[PDB]
């Protein structure tokens, strides 16, 4: 049966995620003309910019308040004030400036809402009166939740800041979740075929930036102030990822009565079907033949693989909880046996997830879902408790388990730095169902050749 249990150890060995501020920084890099300031020590931002570099091989703009010894003793609201001044004074185009707290500035208790109000009435009116500048508090203490909850918080804070319901319209708010450019592309394709306009939070396709002959391009997000304000006017909010867009979706529900459709994460055929059904329901638009065709093209790809190769494969999955769960679900439709799911933070709401209730009702073999997990929860099981696996699905930080215990691994989630180009491919939708199934197969195939495990069978499947 499928047993949900909390990690036993109190400590962390080999972490799956980083802290809430990293999630707020990720939200912020997805907004046009946005540069967050991370209020804390320099590493809290510089290390996170490296994370994003590791995934994308691009540099994104984020600043530090540069906390030092004095501010840690006496308070550091002045460090923020100077930061805002220095940032605005040197970056003329910036219009959005999140103020993102860290463990330090939360503990020492700096009044961020206070110092923002001061700058709005003060500095911004005096020195910068001709400029649009939105300062936004993001309270993201590192000693609760994770980058995942930080993301949820930040999306709420940006929508809370900007959303107004002046001119109701028929658009939806699509909160993609923390996904790849290839996911944004896929989701936009689905919306286009449904003929449904949306505010897409976030438009990060432009993270894949060119080298132009005139050296003029840069990676940036394209979610605009206008789009964020327009979130108040939508007829519904589709928050695909419950752990990354519940707060913003419910905020708009509670504040403007915009209905929130939370999940399921559209991973796999069946979950993509539910998305399209939910769009129809919300908007009244019919599901067109063209998507039934693309769906069937996807199913064809899956048919070639499922009972021949994927059936009964033993899978471990980790990463963002919505990804983990979505993948587990799709794997079961692919006849596979996900046997260990790691959910690598303290969220108390996993046990209440309907998708996890369904797994508990319906799974009929030995499965574990470990909450507050770390990578030692997987490695210890392999090394000392005889867990047998055919495949891992997760991000690159788990890689040494794959490498050193000879279990092949498909790179999914964030960050994926030990493979090239993965951000351009979908994991959601019908296109993503194709990509996941074919790449799991291709991963298994390479492994069968490595180990000489019936490698000769790959001829007339």
């Amino acid at each position: 049966t499928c047993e949900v249990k909390e990690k036993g150890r109190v400590g962390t060995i080999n972490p799956i995620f980083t802290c809430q501020p990293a999630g707020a920084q990720f939200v912020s890099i997805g907004i046009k003309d946005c540069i967050g300031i991370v209020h804390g020590g320099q590493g809290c931002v510089m290390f996170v910019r490296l994370i994003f570099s590791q995934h994308y091989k691009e540099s994104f703009e984020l600043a530090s308040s540069s906390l030092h010894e004095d501010g840690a003793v006496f308070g550091a609201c002045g460090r923020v004030e100077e930061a805002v001044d220095v940032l605005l004074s040197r970056y003329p185009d910036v219009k959005v400036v999140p103020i993102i707290t860290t463990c330090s500035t939360e503990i020492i208790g700096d009044d961020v809402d206070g110092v923002i109000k001061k700058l709005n009435e003060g500095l911004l009116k005096e020195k910068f009166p001709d400029r649009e500048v939105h300062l936004i508090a993001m309270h993201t203490p590192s000693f609760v939740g994770s980058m995942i909850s930080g993301y949820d918080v930040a999306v709420r804070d940006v929508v809370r800041h900007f959303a107004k319901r002046e001119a109701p319209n028929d658009k939806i708010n699509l909160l993609t979740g923390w996904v790849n450019p290839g996911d944004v592309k896929e989701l936009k394709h689905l919306l286009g075929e449904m003929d449904i306009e949306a505010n897409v939070l976030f438009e990060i396709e432009s993270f894949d930036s060119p080298i132009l002959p005139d050296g003029s391009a840069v990676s940036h997000g394209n979610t605009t102030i206008e789009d964020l304000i327009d979130t108040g006017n939508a007829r519904a909010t589709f928050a695909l990822n419950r752990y990354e867009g519940t707060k913003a979706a419910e905020y708009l529900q509670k504040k403007f009565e915009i209905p929130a459709i939370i999940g399921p994460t559209p991973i796999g055929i069946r979950n993509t079907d539910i998305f399209l059904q939910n769009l129809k329901k919300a908007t009244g638009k019919p599901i067109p033949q063209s998507l039934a065709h693309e769906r069937g093209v996807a199913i064809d790809a899956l048919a070639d693989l499922t009972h021949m190769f994927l059936a009964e494969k033993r899978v471990a999955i980790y990463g963002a909880p919505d990804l983990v769960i979505g993948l587990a679900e799709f794997c079961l439709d692919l006849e596979m046996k996900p046997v260990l799911l790691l959910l690598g933070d303290d969220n108390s709401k996993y046990v209440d997830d309907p998708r996890i209730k369904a797994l508990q009702e319906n799974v009929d073999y030995g499965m574990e879902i470990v909450t507050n997990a770390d990578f030692w929860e997987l490695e210890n099981r392999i090394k000392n408790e005889g867990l047998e696996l055919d495949l891992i699905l997760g991000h690159s930080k788990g890689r040494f388990i794959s490498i050193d215990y000879n279990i092949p691994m498909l790179r999914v989630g964030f960050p994926t730095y030990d493979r090239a180009g993965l951000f351009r491919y979908p994991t959601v939708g019908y296109g993503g169902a194709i990509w996941l199934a074919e790449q799991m197969a291709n991963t298994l195939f390479a492994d069968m050749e490595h180990k000489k495990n019936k490698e000769w069978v790959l001829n007339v499947w």
């Binding site: 399209l276 599901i287 048919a303 499922t306 009972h307 679900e329 319906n362 007339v460």
Partner: protein, 515 residues
Amino acid sequence: PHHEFECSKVIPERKKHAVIKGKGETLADALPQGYLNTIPGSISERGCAYCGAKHVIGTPMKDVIHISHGPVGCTYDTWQTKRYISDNDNFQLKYTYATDVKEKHIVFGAEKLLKQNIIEAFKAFPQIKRMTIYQTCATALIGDDINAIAEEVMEEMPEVDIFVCNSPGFAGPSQSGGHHKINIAWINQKVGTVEPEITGDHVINYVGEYNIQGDQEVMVDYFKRMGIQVLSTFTGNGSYDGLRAMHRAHLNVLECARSAEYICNELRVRYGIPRLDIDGFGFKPLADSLRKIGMFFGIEDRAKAIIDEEVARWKPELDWYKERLMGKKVCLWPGGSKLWHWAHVIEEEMGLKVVSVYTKFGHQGDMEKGIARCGEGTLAIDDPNELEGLEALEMLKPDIILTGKRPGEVAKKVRVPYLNAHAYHNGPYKGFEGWVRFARDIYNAIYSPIHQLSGIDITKDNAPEWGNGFRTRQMLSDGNLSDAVRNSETLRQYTGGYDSVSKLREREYPAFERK
């Protein structure tokens, strides 16, 4: 009675090649035609007689340079399309040879080319001292004397032995003429030419077995657990020089009668070796087969020990599948022998209803066995073409077919799942364990949640309002099972690992005491 297809009304000769087994009908009432010429333009499933000789029977020999005398195409087209494995590091899969006949050889012949090729090949593969040369359409037609050139090289190189198979594609209507040709060439050219070392009181030839995914290794496992010397396997995992000592066997154990009855029949006439026909598939047909071989050698207790152990190990897994498969419809659509090997036992032991069988190249003897073994209502077809297969899918509406790869991909489009009857899915399918693997693959194909998904039209306003983002195979299969079955403490899903054969290769066998 005979059956006509809508799609073949315009070619009424086809009506003679299909029968539905009618109420109270016997084999004396109706039988399809078989082993006739093919109708051009029909899109018949059939291959050539080079296929039958070289691709099916010849190439499995594991210690042999398999050289096709002809243009490269015949060779490319038969390379890396088969799963006959060997314990000679799959030499027979990894290395293939073509003479690369060109235009200039059409006028003048290609005898020198042939010879240069043979020398080149033995040079590149110094560990290999055996060779079979297969004739193709082009070399038949230009008239090179392959036998002479082989003799010429065997004179010059007494360390090598070369076999000649003159079975070009156009030599007959199908695969089948190639079967006959290579059987008769082998016994004429090669049997009797090697005296074997005998290591046991009980010696067999295992005949008509090609070791698809390890089938032969499964069966030879059982034989060795009985202290039987397997002198030869014709030809799966077989040794060229082993097969030259077939004249010394005590018993010919024949599985694929279609492909290898010719050599068993001549081995009886030439050397008085008796022919015993067996089934390699299913618990009862295999138990019966092994019991008989045991009795024959007066070692029936050893056979019974294997049977009891194997059935105890695997029956609780076979029966798990049987419960979920009961009443599901299946078409047994291989090329040959498999249709009658499976016809009865698959219904008995897996719970399937056989609604059709076909043969691409089989003789009337194969339809005798097939009709004899299936139930009334069953549609039996000789030399099917694509439209007929498609029409049979619409008319019979089977839950699964067992067929070739590309035929399976035709069925895929019309929402009929397949297993590869020829190459298997997760083979091997012979043996007690193999029978369970077979069942599991069928179960996984029928109750695939992707298959369930594919039948849903998402444009439809009263569509299934999905709840969870998954359905397990068991959620699709177990809904109407009795509580006794659902809660059984004995019935379980298959417990074997991905590769059921590699364990066999690392196995020591208890020696027995010779008289």
